[PDB]
Design a protein around this ligand. Structure first.
Ligand SMILES: CC(C)(COP(=O)(O)OP(=O)(O)OC[C@H]1O[C@@H](n2cnc3c(N)ncnc32)[C@H](O)[C@@H]1OP(=O)(O)O)[C@@H](O)C(=O)NCCC(=O)NCCS
Ligand code: NA
Length: 117
């Protein structure tokens, strides 16, 4: 299930975001979360599997498009389709807009975009 980010989950959200190649230290991560909390165009979501929070997906709303800026799955919960599940849910949630990657999420985005349903 795709849930909205909440401050209760700041620790785990920072845990998951750290697996992104552009997030290399605690200060960078703290700034990213602050940016998600305070910029209205930037929205962070988390993925729940039963109780455990194991995925994070972060976007920027940009008129007709929604740009995926961060995507991460807890290493232990990878290779189970969660990463795609998250993007698919986000496509459903932002159905009025065009979902697009930035340079950092392009490769996994295209991999998923190339699949059959
Ligand atoms: C990308 C990521 C979110 C995928 O999570 P996942 O839950 O394993 O995704 P899915 O199960 O839907 O798909 C897994 C497949 O995606 C592909 N894939 C994984 N990482 C990829 C990447 N960086 N670029 C392109 N394709 C990728 C692989 O083919 C993989 O197949 P395998 O499981 O047989 O090796 C995860 O690897 C991750 O958290 N990476 C660290 C953060 C990151 O680099 N994000 C940017 C992605 S461009
Ligand atoms: Na925000």
């Amino acid at each position: 299930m795709l849930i909205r980010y909440k401050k209760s989950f700041e620790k785990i959200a920072m845990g998951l975001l750290s697996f992104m190649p552009n997030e290399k230290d605690l200060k960078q991560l703290q700034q990213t979360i602050k940016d998600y909390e305070t910029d209205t165009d930037r929205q962070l979501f988390l993925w729940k599997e039963d109780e455990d929070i194991v995925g994070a997906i972060g976007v920027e709303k940009k008129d007709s498009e929604v740009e995926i800026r961060h995507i991460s799955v807890n290493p232990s919960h990878r290779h189970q389709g969660i990463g795609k599940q998250m993007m698919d849910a986000l496509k459903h949630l932002f159905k009025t807009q065009v979902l697009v990657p930035n340079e950092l999420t392009q490769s996994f985005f295209e991999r998923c975009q190339g699949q059959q349903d």
